[PDB]
Amino acid sequence: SFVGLRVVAKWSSNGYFYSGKITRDVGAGKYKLLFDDGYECDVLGKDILLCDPIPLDTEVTALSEDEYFSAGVVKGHRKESGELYYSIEKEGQRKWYKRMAVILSLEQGNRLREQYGLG
Amino acid sequence: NSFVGLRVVAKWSSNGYFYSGKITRDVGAGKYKLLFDDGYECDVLGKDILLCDPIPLDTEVTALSEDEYFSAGVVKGHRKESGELYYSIEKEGQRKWYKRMAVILSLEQGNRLREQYGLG
């Protein structure tokens, strides 16, 4: 089953997909998911993208202090001490981001919906 | 004066943690519109907002890491690097660095700051 797999799930209002993990399967096509910040709730399957990790060359939004819409492209993955890091390219330069800092806007997530969506 | 634009740690959900964020509006009725570092926006009661930027030294906090949601630690240092704040969290005699967005407070941990920094 999908229980225990890491994913990115849309978040109601802003429609952004945040890194999380499916903790239980429920009815009504919903899933109990736990976001990396500790918040747990039920979301619909159509709002979940089975991505661990976000694939290379995906356009994403990389979070940094006082930056909320900074777009970039995934160009690398790296495992270190049981933690995933993303190499994000922007304006010809690459920077390292931790997993939870990499999110997808509605448009960015829609591009993966067909292949990785649980709809 | 005006708390608009000031960074805070605020609890938006019932029985949730205090997360790093920013005040964006005074919406009256003892509420404030907040912008969490992850981009989520919502109104939050003043009593649920801790006006401290950064979190004071020697504060017990929770430091987030992949697959760890309850790791406790104490703040022992602050550092700015490329306009970003980093916390030095001490746990079991060793110190590790965490970005601002990764340092959160539990209800018990946040309660230790209400009297001094709470907007209630």
Ligand SMILES: CC(C)c1cccc(C(=O)NCCCNC(C)(C)C)c1
């Ligand atoms: C990347 C994300 C998982 C994250 C990491 C670190 C801190 C915060 C944060 O400030 N959470 C408060 C707003 C609610 N955020 C969710 C995810 C919609 C529940 C969020």
